[PDB]
Amino acid sequence: HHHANKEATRNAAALFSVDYKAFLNEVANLNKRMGDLRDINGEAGAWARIMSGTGSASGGFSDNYTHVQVGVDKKHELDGLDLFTGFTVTHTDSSASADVFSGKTKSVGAGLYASAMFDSGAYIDLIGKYVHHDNEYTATFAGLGTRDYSTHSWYAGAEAGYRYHVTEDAWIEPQAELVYGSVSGKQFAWKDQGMHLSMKDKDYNPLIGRTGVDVGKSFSGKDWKVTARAGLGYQFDLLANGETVLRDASGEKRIKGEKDSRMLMSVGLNAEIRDNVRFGLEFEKSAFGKYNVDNAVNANFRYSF
């Protein structure tokens, strides 16, 4: 009976954990979202982004996702400060698998951002958005079967960093980011072998921090620039306020959320072609987490005019 409860707990937690990965997948940063916004002349901008990636965690859990996003903004020219304010919309397709389940998630989001680029090299990036998730998951345990459900998430993120130039062409940039969010809970109630089974979790609020450093070496000519860059960071949960409750004829088991953290690694470039076009590309992965990004690639394109 202990073994049964252990397995049930492990499985319920695995299945419900996908809502948290769905949330984590929508978390980016200034460079990953917008590319390089320094020294841009155009007073308006249109941009697109695509990300594709895969991750894993124990229990044979693995997922992969394709994230697509666009935005438009106006750039306000202030005294030593460019301030980009704009709108954004996103789409995500995810699939997930573990030993005991598999399924998919379709997401649609919309948000608002302000990005402040200071001549001094300082920057601040603020974003808030809402994401809707349609979910379809099939479980191989407990006769739970196929389950469709909606969730939605709010995001409020703030990021600051500082680009210190070691030389005219090389630079170092410490960064810190905090992202506060919400994840709607859901319930499954069903019968198996003529017994009433329940599995439910509550609304919770992720709070994800990151601290890291980026480094870059740039090259250019009259009408182009290319920056090679690499990143090392630390991404961590500050809260784990979720809880799954497994109810049963014999009683309830409560399963509290666990914090997880991981080391982020990235390598990439930012390109400038003439006056309107920018392009950003990076390869990334993480290590040491219970969940890790095993690999993902991010591309963006900004047209400034």
Ligand X SMILES: CCCCCCCCOCCOCCOCCOCCO
Nearer of residues 7 and 203 to ligand X, judged by Cβ: 203
Give the Å distances, CA to CA, from 238 to 40, 254, 260.
35, 21, 9
Identify the residue among 53, 103, 206, 212 touching ligand X (CB under 6 A).
212
Out of 43, 77, 134, 275, the only residue in the binding site for ligand X (CB under 6 A) is 275
Instruction: Say whether residue 195 binds ligand X (CB under 6 A).
Output: no
- How many CB atoms are located within 10 Å of the residue 220 CB? 11
Of 8 and 116, the one with the shorter C-beta distance to ligand X is 116
- Is the distance from CB of 254 to CB of 199 less than 8 angstroms? no
Least Cβ distance, residue 209 to ligand X (angstroms): 10
CB nearer to ligand X: give 32 or 129. Answer: 129
How far apart are CB 193 and ligand X at their closest, in Å? 37
Broken C–N links (> 2.5 Å) in the chain, after residues: none
Minimum distance, C-beta of residue 239 to ligand X, in the bound complex (Å): 15
Q: Please state the closest distance from residue 7 (CB atom) to ligand X, in A.
A: 26
Closest chain position to ligand X (CB): 276
Taking CB under 6 A as the criterion, the residue among 13, 68, 108, 126 binding ligand X is 126
DSSP 8-state assignment for residue 275: T
> CA 260 to CA 268: how far, in whole Å?
26
> Residue 39: which residues within 8 A CB-CB, separation 6 or more?
none
Q: Rounded to 5 degrees, what are φ and ψ at 197?
A: -120, 140
- List the one residue out of 197, 217, 203, 213 whose CA is nearest residue 266: 213
The CA distance from 282 to 49, in Å, is: 12
Which element (helix H / strand E) includes 16?
helix 2-24
Give yes or no for residue 226 binding ligand X (CB under 6 A): yes
* By CB under 6 A, residue 114 contacts ligand X: yes
User: Residue 239, interface with ligand X (CB under 6 A)?
Assistant: no
Closest CB 39 distance from ligand X, rounded Å: 14
111 interacts with ligand X by CB under 6 A: yes
- Report the residue count for the chain: 305
CB-based contacts of 199, cutoff 8 Å, min separation 6: 12, 16, 144, 187, 188, 189, 244, 245, 246, 247
Q: Is 297 near ligand X (CB under 6 A)?
A: no
Regarding 209 and contact with ligand X (CB under 6 A), the answer is no
| By CB under 6 A, residue 76 contacts ligand X | no
- In the complex, the smallest distance separating the C-beta of residue 227 from ligand X, rounded to whole angstroms, is 8
Q: How many CB atoms lie within 10 A of CB 272?
A: 22
Closer CB to ligand X, residue 119 or residue 192? 119
Single out the segment in contact with ligand X by CB under 6 A; choices: 62-70, 105-113, 191-199, 246-254. Answer: 105-113
The dihedral built from the CA positions of residue 237, 241, 242 and 244, taken in this order, carries a sign that is positive
66 or 205, CB closer to ligand X?
205
Q: Which of 193, 103, 176 is nearest to 142 (CA)?
A: 193
Q: Which residues bind ligand X (CB under 6 A)?
A: 44, 72-74, 85-87, 110-112, 114, 118, 120, 122, 124, 126-130, 154, 156, 158, 160, 166, 170, 172, 174, 176, 211-213, 215-217, 226, 228-230, 232-234, 261-263, 267, 271, 273-277, 279, 288-289
